[PDB]
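Ticket reopened. Same input as before:
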Amino acid sequence: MLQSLNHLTLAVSDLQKSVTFWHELLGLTLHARWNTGAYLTCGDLWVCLSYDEARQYVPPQESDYTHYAFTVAEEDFEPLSQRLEQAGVTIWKQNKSEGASFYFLDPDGHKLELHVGSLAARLAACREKPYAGMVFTSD
Amino acid sequence: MLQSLNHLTLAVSDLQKSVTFWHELLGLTLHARWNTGAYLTCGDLWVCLSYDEARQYVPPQESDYTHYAFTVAEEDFEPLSQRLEQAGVTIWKQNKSEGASFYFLDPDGHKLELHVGSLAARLAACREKPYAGMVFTSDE
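Engineering reply: fixed in the latest deploy. New output:
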């Protein structure tokens, strides 16, 4: 089977700007860096920033709903939202779904999200107000 | 402090096709499904397939290097590769490294990867044969 996510690779246009953002702003730990990439960790997750000649800034109106969500502790959600806003981050969605969620772009427009709450919590919420046609696989 | 990846959401064009691919072919466990999405897991990873009116198939040469790598056991790599090849999966890249990596597309073109090996293993391989400009953070 697929055991887990091995690593997330994001195409970037300016490695220096991207490392600053992911390592200093978002606080990921930096393990290695070379001319055209960087390896970082977020918890267990291996995140690779990869220089790609073809990458440009992609505004949120062009890119679709594909996005990457990172877990924050409940008491950390507010101060981290605040830190991101003050850094002038672009908000791509207002929150309306289950749990504190905060939606912001990376320096190349990768759609990011801060989120408090597991899948278990989302499933719990969906048991009470199901989405249209919802079917839970545990039958 | 972001604590971990919370979930990966992929925009899809055809939820039925995508669920079949992710759940049946790739074998992720399905937890829930509704009219415009599904929730699956891959180990500790929450994966959400989300129907998006704006999503079409994106040819691998039209999208950049952004990709999602998934861990497989070493004994699982070859047989999983061939099972994917036999299913008519598209290969978007030749593995030119010395590690085990298989590059393939989901039904909408999301770039995925089977990979054997940890960050620690890549690093150790990089110490032996470093990339240009390589800096290793272990050096205070």
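The CA atoms of residues 19 and 51 of chain B lie 11 Å apart. Chain B has one domain: 1-140. Please confirm and we'll close it.
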